[PDB]
C-alpha cells in the first residue's frame, strides 16, 4: 500500500477550510498558549520612543478537525504540516509600530488531537515611553502586548503554554554582550473590551531593560570632571594673570568642542537633556562668567563703592621725578589693588559655586549608579 | 450532521464573485463608515514636508450576498471570513507619498444582514505644508484625506461610522512622550470634482499636533546666549588691545560654525526661515560691526570734521639729558592729542554696539515669550 | 433573475485572457492615451543625481473584448473590473532608476464599448542631470520618458488624453510650500529606434523646476559678505603689526571653514563646481597673498633696492647723558629701517585691498544676475 | 513519441506533495548534507553586535518518491525541477537578526534515486559577541549555527557534505580588500535540547575573521606618540616657568582634541572600552596634575616646613640720589631675586613626573607591540 | 471564426511546462546570447568595496516547443507572452551582494520558429576590488560575471549577441553628466570548473570607469596647498618670535578641522588610503615639529652641550659711576641674549632644515599631482 504520512495528509486537508475556525459548536473559543523568549535587544532608539527586538515565539492551539486514530496511519502521532494550509489566529502585538523583517516558517507540527504547534522567530518595532533623565543608568519598562485584532473573547482566548516565573527566569538565549541588559520579562493577563459585547483578551510582557554605561561614563562624564578639575586649578591660579586668561579660554574652547559633539552623542527627548548636560550647561556657564570677570578685572586694572558694599555684605629734581616715576605703581597701586581684591573675592565666590556644582555632579552620579545597582 | 459554520461558509462563499460590487440594483451606491483613531506621531521631516503616523482604522459596509438565516445554522450570526475571498473597496489617501510597512489583517467579520467590519492598523506617510517659521513653537494643521481613487460617488458614499466629536476627543490610544503632542482630529465631508462625471466623495481628518520645545530650547538657544554673552564680554575687551581682535575673529568663527550644525542640526526650512535664526545672524552682524570698528580706531590712534558734523547732526536728530629724559618720561604719554581724537569714539561706540546687542537679545526673548504665548494657548 | 452586474461579469471574464492583447486583427496597434499631475517634488539628490516625485498617473485604452450591450445587462454602461483579471500594457520609464514604493489600485472602470481607464499614483525614482554651476538659482530640465519596454510602436502608440497646453497649465495639484517650485510641464511625443526595423513610441514630460534660495542665502550668502567685509577692515590695519596678520589668518581660518560646509552642504556634482566657491577661493587667495607679502615686509623691517628698481619699473606705467640720550634716540631711531620697507608694504597693502574689494564687487554683481536669470523664468 | 524530460516532470511532479517530508517509514528521519562557503565580509557593526555577510550555501538531501529508472526516460539521469514544486527542509539560523536579501533560485537538480541538490546564496545578517579590548588589533569568533526551527533529529539530522579540513582550506572565494581577513571556517557539530522531547540537531560554522589595522594605526597611534613626545619635552623644562604652563595648555588643547578624535573615530560596545583610550587619559591625567604641580610651583616661588620634613622621608624611601636711580633699576633685579627654597622639594617632585610619564608611556608601546606580535600570531 | 492572436496563445500555453528545459533532445543545451548595456553608474562605496549600477539587459534563446505555422494564423510571425508562464533561465551574477529593486517585465516577445526576447532593466549591486591610492584621479577595472548558479555548459552554454567592439563602443545611452565617466565594457568569455563534471559556462563584462576630480582639486587640493604655503611663510620666520609659535597654532586648528572634512570627504578606506592623506600627515607632524623646535629655541633664549651643538654646526658645514654702571645695564640690557645669539643662530638655520623638508614634501606632493593627471588623462 501507499505510506502512512501521505495518506494522513490526504485525508486531513481535503475537504478542509482554512477561513473557517477549527471548531464545531462556534459557542465555544479556542485559546492559545504561547510563549515569549527575548533573544536580543536591537536598537534603543530615544528620540523616535521605539523599540527594536528579536524573539522566539511560540504558539498553541486546538484544531477539531485536524485529528485521526494513530493505529490506522502505522501508529503516526506527530505530523509535520504547512501553515499556509490550516486556519491561524491573528494574534498580534497593539504597541506594533513597523514591520520586522523576519522570515517565514512554512511548516507546523499537529498531533493526532488537534493540537498545533507553531514556532517562529520575529524581529518586531514598538513604541515605548522612554525616561532618559538618567541617561546611563536609565532603565525601562517597556510593554508587548499580544492580542488578536479582531477576534473576540468568545472566539479567541490568550492564555500561556507555562508559568509565569519560568518566563520570568529565562535566559537561556538572551545575549549579555550588548548595550542593554534584560532584568526579567514580566507577563501580565488581562481583559480588554472597546465597548459592552466587544470584549477583548490580551497578554502582555512587561520587557524589563538595563544600561551599561561603562562606555558612555568613561567616554563622557570624566573627561567632564577632567574638564571640571582643570577648571577648578585654573581658579587656583593666581588672580588677573593674563596665564589664567589663556586658561580660561582653552578650557572654553574645550568645553565647546565637547558639548557639540557629545550633543550628538547624547540622545535627547521630549523631557529636554538628561541630568549630565545639565551639568555641563552650568559648568561651562561659570567658566564663561569666571573668564569674563577676568578680562573684566584685567581691563579695569588698565588705568565702584555701591558694589563694594554689596559685596562686604554678601557674607636732583629730576631724579625725584623719575622716582617718582618709581613710585607711579604705588600711586596707581591703592585703586588697582581694591579694585584687584574685589575681583580676586568673586574669584573665589566662583569657585566655591563651582565646587558645588561638581559635588552635586558625584552625588548624583552615585545615587543614579545606586539606583542601578538596584539589581 | 456537519458544523454550522462549515456549513454556512460553504453557502455564503461559494458562486460569491470577490470582483463585483456588492449589490444587486447597480444604480445604488454602497457606502463606507470609518473611524480614526491616532495612535502615534512617529516622525515629522520639515525639510520635505512629510508626515509619518500610525492609526487604527475601522470601516463599515454592507454587502447583498453575504446574507443568510440564523436559525438554519444554529441561531448564529456572526462569522469571520477572509479578507481576500470578498469584495473590498478601494479606499485610500489622497495626500499619499509613499506606502507605508502596515501589517495585513487576513480576517472580517460578517453578520447575517450583509455588514461587514474590517479593522486593521495603518502606518500612513503623508504630505503636509509645515510652517518652520515659529519652528520650536508651532502648530500644524495637517490633514488626513480619504477616499476612493477610482469609484465614483455613485458607487461610494464616504461616511462617518461615529459622531464628530467622539472622534475628535478619542484621545483614549496616544502616547505622550514622543516629541510631538495630538491637541485634536477634526473630521469633515465634502464632495470633490475634477470635473463633470468625477463626482468623487471625501473625508477631511484634520490632524493637529504641537510641538514640544524643549530639547531644542535647552540645547540650542543657551549655547547661542553663551555666543551673545561672549560676544558682549568682546565688546567690553579694552578697545586698544588687539587680543580683542582674536576674541571676536573667534566668536566671528563660533557663530559661523553655529550656523554651520544648525544647518546640519535642525531640519532647516523649505520656506521661509525661523525667527532664531534671524536673530542670531543679527548678533552676528553686530559683531563683525564692533570687529571692523575697534580695528578702525585702533590704526586711527596708532577727519575729525567728519567726526564733528557727524556728531553736529546726531546732536540736531537727539530731538640737560636729565631734563631730556624726563621729556622721555612724558613721551610715554605724548601721542595722547591723537588718542583722545578718536577714544571718545572708541568707547562710545563700544557701549552703542553693546546696547543695541542687549536690544537685540531683549526682541528675542520678546518673540521667544509671545510664541510661548501662541503654544500655551493652543 | 440575477442582478445584470455578476452576469455581466460572467459573460466578460470567462473566456477571457490576460497574456493576449486585446485586439481582433493583430496588425493594428493598442493606442493608449495618458496623462500626468505633479502631485509634489519630494527630494532631488545633487550628489546621487536623482529626482523623486509623486504623479497621479492616468491611462486609457481600448479592449475589443469587454464589449456588451447595455439593454441586456439593464442598461449598464459602467463598472468596475479588477486590474488583475485583464490585459494592461507595460508602460515604463526609461529615465527610471529604483522601484517606486507606491501603492496599488485593484480596480479598474470598463465602458461597454470597450474603453477603460487606470487611474493610479505612481512615486518615481529616476535620473536627472543637474547644472548646479547657478547653485543658488539653478533651474532644471528634467525629464520623464513613457514607453514600452519591450512593445513596438507597431503594438503599442502612446497618446495624450489631454492637449499640452492644457498639461503644462496644471498646477491645480501641487504643494507650494517645498524648496522646489513647478513652472511647467512640457511633452513631445517622438519616436525611438534602438535599431531599425524596431521602431519604438516615446511620449516624453519635461519637468521642469525651480529653488527656493531663501534659507540657503542666508546660511551661506551673508556670512560669506560679512568675512569679505571683515577682511576689507582688516586690510585697513597698519602693516607692521602682526594682529593684522592674526586677524588675516584666522580669518583664512575662516574662510576655509566656509568652504568645508561649502564642500559639505554642496555634495554636488564632481563635473562641475558653482562659481560661489570659485569667488569665495580666491577671496581666500588674495587673503593669502597679503599675508605672505605681510610676512616677508615684516622680516625685512627691522634690519632691497633692486625691490625699488622694480617696483619703479611698474610706476612707470657726559659720556653717559649721551647714553642716556642715545638709549631715547635709537628706540625711537629703530623705525628708520622699518620704513624703508613700509613704504612699499603700504602700497602692496593697498593693491591687494583693491583687487579684494574688486573680487567682492564681482560676487556681488553675480549674484545679482543670478537673480535676475531666476526671476526670468 | 513526446521528450523525455517533458515525461519524467509529468511522471514526476504528479501526486507529490510539497507539505509531506519525503519518506516512506516515517520513524526514519531524512539528512541533509551542506557545505558553506564565504565570499566576502560585507560590514562589522562594532556597536550594535552585528556581522553581515554573503555565502555560497550548498545543500543535499533525499526524496524517496523523485526516483525513477533513466531506462525508460531516454538514460535521463538528472533534471531541473523548481524548487517550490516539492518538499524543501525550514534549515535556517538561530543567529538570524534580520532577514537577508537572497534571490530565489527556482531550479534544483534532481538525480534518479531521490537525491537532491540545491545550491544558493544566502546574504545573511546575524549577531556576533565581539572583543573590541584589542581594538587596533581585534580578532572575533563569530558563529552561524544551522538548524531547523521547527523539524527534530527525528526527522531531520543535520550532516556535512565534504570533510572539515576541506572546508577551513577553502578560501579559493573571497575578496581580500575588505576592511576584515578570512582565517578559517571551523565546523562542529552538536544535538540542541532546550528540553527532552526538543532533540534539535545542529551544524556550526565558527567563521573567523582578522581586521587591517594600517589605517587604525596611523589614525590613533601616531597623533597619539607625537603627543606623548610632546609631554616628554614637556616635563623637561625646569620649573617656574610660564612656557611650561603656557606648553602644558597647549597641550591639554591637544590631548582635549584627541580625546574627541578617539570618541569620534572607534565605535564601541558598552560592555568594555579599549585600552588605547585608557592610556589617552592616563597620560592626560599625568599631564594635568603635572600642570597643577607647576602651579603650585609659581605661587611657591612667588612666595609649609611639614611638607619638606615629610618630603625628607620621602626621599629617603626613594633612595646717593644717583644710588635712588640706580635703585629704580635695581627693583628690576629685586624682583628677580626675591626667591623660595620651597621650589627644592618643588622639582624635586618633578623628579616623579620623569618616571610615571616614562613608566606610562613604555606600558603603552609594550602592549601595543604586543598587540601586533599576537595579530602577526594568528 | 475567433482572432488568430488567441487561438495561438490557447495552442501553445497549453500542454506547456515552466519547469521543463524547452528542449526536445535532453542531451544539447539551451544556448543564451545576451547583452549588456549600461544606463549610469549611482554610487561607489569605496569604504564598503561596492558597486551599484543600472543596465538594460537581453537575453535570447530559442524554445522548441513554442512554434508554429504563421499561414494557420493569419501569417503572425510574433507575439507577446506572460513572461511567468514559460521556462526562462536562472541566469544571475557571480559578484551580486544584495538584492537590486529592479521593476518587472511581464512580457516577452517569441517568434514563430522558437526564439524568445526578454528585456529588462537590471538595478544591480556588486562587490569590486577597488584602488583609492590615486583616490582624486583613480580608474578601476569592475568585474560584472553572468553565468547560471545551478545548470552546467551541458545545459546552458551562455553565447553573447553582439561583437565585443559593439559592446565596448556603445556608450551612447551612458549619461555623462554624473560623478563617474565610463571608458569601456570589455566582454571576455570564459568556462569555470572548481570541481570536476561542473562545467558552469559564463561571461564576463569588465566594467572600467573614469573620477572626475575637478570638483575635488577646487575642494581639497588647492586649499591643502593654501595651507601648506602659510605654513611655508611661517617657516620663512625667525625662531624668536612667538608669533611664529602663535602662526603655527592658527594653522593647526585649521588641520584640526580638516580632520572633520577629511574623514567625511576624503573616503577613507581601512585596507588602504591615498597618497594625498599621506602628504598632509606628512605636513601636519613637520608644523608641530617645527613648534617644538621654536619652542626650544624659546627655552634656549632664556638663560641657564654648545661644543656639542658646534660638533653639529660641523656636521652642516659637511652636509652644506653709578651712571657708568647703569649705563654698564643699558648695554648688558640690549645685550642680555650674549649666549642665545649662538643658539638663535643654530634655531634660524634649523628653521631653515624644516623648511627644506617641508618644501620637498610640498613640491613632491604637487610632482605627484601632476603624474596622477598624466596617468589619468593617459586613459
Redesign the interface.
Known sequence: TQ????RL?DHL?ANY?????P????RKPTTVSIDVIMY?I??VDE????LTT?IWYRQYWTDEFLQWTPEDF?N?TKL???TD?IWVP?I?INE????G???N?????VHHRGEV?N???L?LVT?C???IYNFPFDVQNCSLTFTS???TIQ?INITLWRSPEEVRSDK?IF?????WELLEVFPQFKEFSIDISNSYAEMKFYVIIR??????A???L??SI??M??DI?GF???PDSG?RV??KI?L???Y??????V?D?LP??????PLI?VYF?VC??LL?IS??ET??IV?LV?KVPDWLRHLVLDR?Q??????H??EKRDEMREVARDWLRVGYVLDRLLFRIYLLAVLAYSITLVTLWSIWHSS
Open positions: 505510506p502512512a504520512l501521505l495528509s486537508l477550510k482554512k477561513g473557517v475556525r471548531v464545531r459548536d462556534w536580543a536591537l536598537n528620540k523616535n520612543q521605539v528579536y502505522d503516526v509535520s504540516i504547512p494550509s491573528d498580534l506594533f509600530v513597523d514591520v523583517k523576519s522570515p516558517i512554512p511548516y507546523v507540527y504547534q514556532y517562529k522567530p524581529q513604541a515611553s522612554l525616561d485584532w479582531l477576534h472566539d537561556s545575549i549579555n554582550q550588548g548595550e544600561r551599561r554605561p561603562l562606555f558612555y568613561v567616554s563622557l570624566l573627561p577632567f574638564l578639575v582643570v586649578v587656583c591660579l593666581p596665564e589663556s586658561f582653552t572654553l574652547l574645550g565647546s568642542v565637547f558639548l557639540i559633539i550633543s552623542t535627547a527627548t521630549a523631557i529636554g537633556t548636560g550647561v561651562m556657564a564663561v573668564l569674563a578680562i573684566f581691563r588698565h636732583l629730576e631724579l625725584s621725578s623719575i622716582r616715576f618709581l
